[PDB]
Amino acid sequence: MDETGKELVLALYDYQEKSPREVTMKKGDILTLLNSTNKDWWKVEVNDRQGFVPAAYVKKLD
Helix, strand or coil: CCCCCCCCEEECCCCCCCCCCCCCCCCCCECCEEECCCCCCCEEECCCCEEECCHHHEEECC
């Protein structure tokens, strides 16, 4: 559980956190998913923090 594909997702383009609900992402960075039930809806963990990120702006398992 430390590779770029299985249980991992690649960033297509950085983001901007202009709110406490939003989240900042970096193109190329790695985002470990904690729970995935929906396609458009994704829930990842960042520094013991939870938020909503653009799943469409990323791809898991290549």
